[PDB]
Design a protein around this motif. Sequence first.
Motif, PDB file in Angstrom:
ATOM      1  N   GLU A 190       0.952  -0.975   0.090  1.00  0.00           N
ATOM      2  CA  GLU A 190      -0.097  -0.315   0.009  1.00  0.00           C
ATOM      3  C   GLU A 190       0.853   1.260  -0.004  1.00  0.00           C
ATOM      4  N   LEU A 191       1.020   1.859  -1.182  1.00  0.00           N
ATOM      5  CA  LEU A 191       1.668   3.075  -1.084  1.00  0.00           C
ATOM      6  C   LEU A 191       1.138   3.986  -0.203  1.00  0.00           C
ATOM      7  N   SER A 192      -0.019   4.483  -0.632  1.00  0.00           N
ATOM      8  CA  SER A 192      -0.778   5.444   0.392  1.00  0.00           C
ATOM      9  C   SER A 192      -1.972   4.547   0.413  1.00  0.00           C
ATOM     10  N   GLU A 193      -3.030   5.329   1.303  1.00  0.00           N
ATOM     11  CA  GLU A 193      -4.498   4.560   1.488  1.00  0.00           C
ATOM     12  C   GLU A 193      -4.953   4.183   0.385  1.00  0.00           C
ATOM     13  N   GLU A 194      -5.270   4.880  -0.756  1.00  0.00           N
ATOM     14  CA  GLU A 194      -5.440   4.399  -1.907  1.00  0.00           C
ATOM     15  C   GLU A 194      -4.339   4.005  -2.745  1.00  0.00           C
ATOM     16  N   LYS A 195      -3.032   4.444  -2.587  1.00  0.00           N
ATOM     17  CA  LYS A 195      -2.136   4.125  -3.556  1.00  0.00           C
ATOM     18  C   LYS A 195      -1.606   2.955  -3.420  1.00  0.00           C
ATOM     19  N   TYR A 196      -1.471   2.091  -4.463  1.00  0.00           N
ATOM     20  CA  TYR A 196      -1.052   0.828  -4.189  1.00  0.00           C
ATOM     21  C   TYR A 196      -0.126   0.364  -5.129  1.00  0.00           C
ATOM     22  N   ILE A 197       0.832  -0.327  -4.779  1.00  0.00           N
ATOM     23  CA  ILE A 197       1.759  -1.058  -5.390  1.00  0.00           C
ATOM     24  C   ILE A 197       1.221  -2.646  -5.601  1.00  0.00           C
ATOM     25  N   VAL A 198       0.839  -2.971  -6.763  1.00  0.00           N
ATOM     26  CA  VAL A 198       0.299  -4.246  -7.127  1.00  0.00           C
ATOM     27  C   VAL A 198       0.883  -4.809  -8.369  1.00  0.00           C
ATOM     28  N   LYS A 199       1.466  -5.942  -8.090  1.00  0.00           N
ATOM     29  CA  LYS A 199       1.878  -6.741  -9.362  1.00  0.00           C
ATOM     30  C   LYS A 199       0.599  -7.421  -9.958  1.00  0.00           C
ATOM     31  N   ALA A 200       0.325  -7.102 -11.192  1.00  0.00           N
ATOM     32  CA  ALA A 200      -0.838  -7.771 -11.794  1.00  0.00           C
ATOM     33  C   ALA A 200      -0.522  -9.214 -11.859  1.00  0.00           C
ATOM     34  N   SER A 201      -1.478 -10.033 -11.256  1.00  0.00           N
ATOM     35  CA  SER A 201      -1.449 -11.443 -11.560  1.00  0.00           C
ATOM     36  C   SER A 201      -1.050 -12.070 -12.667  1.00  0.00           C
ATOM     37  N   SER A 202      -1.251 -11.111 -13.813  1.00  0.00           N
ATOM     38  CA  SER A 202      -1.019 -11.644 -15.208  1.00  0.00           C
ATOM     39  C   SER A 202       0.094 -10.802 -15.673  1.00  0.00           C
ATOM     40  N   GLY A 203       0.695 -10.154 -14.798  1.00  0.00           N
ATOM     41  CA  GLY A 203       1.964  -9.231 -15.506  1.00  0.00           C
ATOM     42  C   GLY A 203       2.482  -8.239 -14.312  1.00  0.00           C
ATOM     43  N   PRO A 204       3.307  -7.349 -14.953  1.00  0.00           N
ATOM     44  CA  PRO A 204       4.192  -6.423 -13.993  1.00  0.00           C
ATOM     45  C   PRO A 204       3.412  -5.579 -12.933  1.00  0.00           C
ATOM     46  N   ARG A 205       4.258  -4.829 -12.290  1.00  0.00           N
ATOM     47  CA  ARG A 205       3.762  -4.037 -11.163  1.00  0.00           C
ATOM     48  C   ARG A 205       3.011  -2.795 -11.765  1.00  0.00           C
ATOM     49  N   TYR A 206       1.836  -2.173 -11.045  1.00  0.00           N
ATOM     50  CA  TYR A 206       1.151  -1.119 -11.153  1.00  0.00           C
ATOM     51  C   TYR A 206       0.763  -0.173 -10.075  1.00  0.00           C
ATOM     52  N   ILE A 207       1.010   1.262 -10.197  1.00  0.00           N
ATOM     53  CA  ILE A 207       0.629   2.071  -9.252  1.00  0.00           C
ATOM     54  C   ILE A 207      -0.967   1.969  -9.663  1.00  0.00           C
ATOM     55  N   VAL A 208      -1.784   1.853  -8.355  1.00  0.00           N
ATOM     56  CA  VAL A 208      -3.082   1.723  -8.568  1.00  0.00           C
ATOM     57  C   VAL A 208      -3.522   2.458  -7.364  1.00  0.00           C
ATOM     58  N   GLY A 209      -4.865   2.776  -7.458  1.00  0.00           N
ATOM     59  CA  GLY A 209      -5.567   3.356  -6.005  1.00  0.00           C
ATOM     60  C   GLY A 209      -6.787   1.980  -5.766  1.00  0.00           C
ATOM     61  N   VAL A 210      -7.469   2.483  -4.933  1.00  0.00           N
ATOM     62  CA  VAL A 210      -8.667   1.745  -4.108  1.00  0.00           C
ATOM     63  C   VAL A 210      -9.592   1.667  -5.428  1.00  0.00           C
ATOM     64  N   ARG A 211     -10.931   1.186  -4.927  1.00  0.00           N
ATOM     65  CA  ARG A 211     -11.837   1.467  -5.798  1.00  0.00           C
ATOM     66  C   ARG A 211     -13.017   2.051  -4.676  1.00  0.00           C
ATOM     67  N   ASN A 212     -13.881   0.691  -4.457  1.00  0.00           N
ATOM     68  CA  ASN A 212     -15.154   1.154  -3.571  1.00  0.00           C
ATOM     69  C   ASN A 212     -15.367  -0.116  -3.103  1.00  0.00           C
ATOM     70  N   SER A 213     -16.226  -0.109  -1.891  1.00  0.00           N
ATOM     71  CA  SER A 213     -16.349  -1.139  -1.229  1.00  0.00           C
ATOM     72  C   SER A 213     -15.133  -1.812  -0.556  1.00  0.00           C
ATOM     73  N   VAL A 214     -13.953  -1.277  -0.760  1.00  0.00           N
ATOM     74  CA  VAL A 214     -12.665  -1.397  -0.641  1.00  0.00           C
ATOM     75  C   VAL A 214     -12.212  -1.110   1.044  1.00  0.00           C
ATOM     76  N   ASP A 215     -11.667  -1.933   1.503  1.00  0.00           N
ATOM     77  CA  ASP A 215     -11.183  -1.415   2.765  1.00  0.00           C
ATOM     78  C   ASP A 215      -9.712  -1.226   2.762  1.00  0.00           C
ATOM     79  N   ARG A 216      -9.380   0.157   3.017  1.00  0.00           N
ATOM     80  CA  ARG A 216      -8.071   0.414   2.722  1.00  0.00           C
ATOM     81  C   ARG A 216      -7.306   0.053   4.084  1.00  0.00           C
ATOM     82  N   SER A 217      -7.933  -0.417   4.927  1.00  0.00           N
ATOM     83  CA  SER A 217      -7.559  -1.190   6.140  1.00  0.00           C
ATOM     84  C   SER A 217      -7.095  -2.551   5.539  1.00  0.00           C
TER      85      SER A 217
END
Lengths: 59, 358, 319, 65
Positions: free
Chosen positions: B49-76
């Motif tokens: 979790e970069l920031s509460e929204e900002k995330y470091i997520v490697k795609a299960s299909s492929g490389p890393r991406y900077i992404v945010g949360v969306r909704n019904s999402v628990d940044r917890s």
Amino acid sequence: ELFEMARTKKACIIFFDEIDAVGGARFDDGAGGDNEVQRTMLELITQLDGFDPRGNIKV
Amino acid sequence: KLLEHRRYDDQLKQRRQNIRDLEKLYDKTENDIKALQSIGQLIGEVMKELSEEKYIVKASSGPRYIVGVRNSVDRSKLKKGVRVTLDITTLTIMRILPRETDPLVYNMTSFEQGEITFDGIGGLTEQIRELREVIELPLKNPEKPPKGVLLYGPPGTGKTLLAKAVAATIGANFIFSPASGIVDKYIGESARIIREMFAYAKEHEPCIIFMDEVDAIGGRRFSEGTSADREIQRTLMELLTQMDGFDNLGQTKIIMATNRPDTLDPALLRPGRLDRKVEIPLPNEAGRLEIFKIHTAKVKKTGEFDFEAAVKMSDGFNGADIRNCATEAGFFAIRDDRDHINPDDLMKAVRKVAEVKK
Amino acid sequence: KNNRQLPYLVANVVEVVGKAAVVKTSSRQTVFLPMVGLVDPDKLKPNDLVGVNKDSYLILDTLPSEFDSRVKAMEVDEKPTETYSDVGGLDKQIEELVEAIVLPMKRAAPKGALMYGPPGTGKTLLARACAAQTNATFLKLAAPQLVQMYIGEGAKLVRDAFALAKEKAPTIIFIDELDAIGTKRFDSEKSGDREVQRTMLELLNQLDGFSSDDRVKVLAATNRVDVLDPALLRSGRLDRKIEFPLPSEDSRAQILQIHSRKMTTDDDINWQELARSTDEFNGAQLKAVTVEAGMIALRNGQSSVKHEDFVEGISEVQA
Amino acid sequence: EARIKEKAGVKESDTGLAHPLQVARCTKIIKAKYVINLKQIAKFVVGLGERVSPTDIEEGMRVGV
């Protein structure tokens, strides 16, 4: 691919100089590395046996 | 005149009953019809979790991406290594997920316990006990746990079956490992494979890990040059890493398999990796006779069928060779028309069994 | 509308809450989807062929596992018709053949038998004979294919060879010169050929995976085997170690018969003579004699082929 | 001429973004794509039932297996 294009080239002479390259009969499978080289013959051995027309495709 | 009630109710009953027979299928199909609007949504684990929204997520299909949360999402709840559903365009979380991977019954092979217990193959009883105590029990007695156990000798003698018979006795999930699939080509996939084999089991523990005859993904290799051997060494080491590394067998245990032991990495045999080198000698004339009346006599046979004299001529056989002895006489049985094997069927086989090899 | 495409990408499965599924494409891409319309949770399971909208990643179809590679170079002549009158003298093992395949097939055990002795006898034909006889799927399978660059490609191939054959099972899988894949060496150097080994091991494990399937019949020929295994001799694995002795002379007279059979002949012939003069010919050397005698007989002008012709086929150096 | 002629031929591939051949990429037609990829991108088989296309399965100009 040989035996493939053998039948493509049918009435074709498959010619091997250096049957000694792959070698002949051997136990060097007892060493164990030669196996594929041995098989490469057995390859050649196997496939040439059953289906290949050798009246047309010359060996 | 009164035949109409039928012709009324005949139509009626069926008709009124034919109502939802037809009607059910619509909505179901309609759901299927409808669900065709429901569209696929990408997957990945949160690297972090970069920031509460900002995330470091490697795609299960492929490389890393900077992404945010969306909704019904628990940044917890969003946390490292957490599988999440991801977006195709927005490229953000499309859902937060549980997780597991791999063909559990295929790439992993998941069978629970074993088919027949240790007893059915009995006559290996030395091992039978000996392994159980060093495998099953150390679970139930907190007072090292065992590192590893390696069969050797001829397989399937009950040998391969031992594993199932082993697997049966504990209650753990038997997880079978054939080798080369763990690194076919597939120019990689090593720990990910094995750790799923570890971790799934590590979560699904108790689990039995049984790695078949591991000389392609096991063993010290050759010149120790690179055939892709560097793949093997890794793979060879991936276990070593899980073994000489802190990874334990929590409730999941590992059965090593080889038909010849000396075919393995010396470092593999080491404690911290292997605490047991499991021999499987041939059954003695006793062990044979033991296994004999075990594997054999349970196939229907006469008392006429020759029990010990067969065993007398039965020498240097294995548990399945014993079965061969049965199975061979069975030829003569079906050749003599026998559900019950007769001594006739038998010792023809016995020598014939003692013929090809010892 | 959404139907269909040739082909789809396929994908494999994790979840099947209960309405949920996640799958990883032939593009190596994982999407979640609420389980799509055209599929069934039982159809659903990991490792599967599935029609999926490539764009939407919406699974369209479940796909049967069919074009899961037959390593199409794998040569399946389906149960070709060949008699035991094809190459005679082998009735010894022909019985065993029956005894190791036919009878295990039709009643209530071995999953396969093990040949040895030089082919060209028609050892192949023997298979092909049973390919007709038992009416189980014949797989003429060269290990060189099982011999690959990809790691465990063969095993995959073997698995490939295993599975789709298990569909066509009852099947007789023929293997030529097992010792190709029949040497594990001795050692921890076995990665030297992990292929030929593990493929064997994989095969062994496949031979290990079942017992009672007569649907799977496993037929392996060598001139002679190298390494032994109670896998190589086992009920459910290779059970039967089957000799192919270079035939006796009347047996050769029996085989030369079949070769002399389709030949035009004046019957100067006496087979046993030829059979006696000949030594341990696997069938085709008689046939070679048969062959040569013919070319000879033409060089003799003879439409019919005579004993002398055959003598001259023999005369054509048999060593 | 031949250019624009075979530009049709070019475009005759270029629809759906598409003697060894190795790989036909005859690409991304979903209704349909009618091609094999033997390659680490999107491996493909047209079959499973009776599956053809009148002259040519599909595209790449590559059409085939």
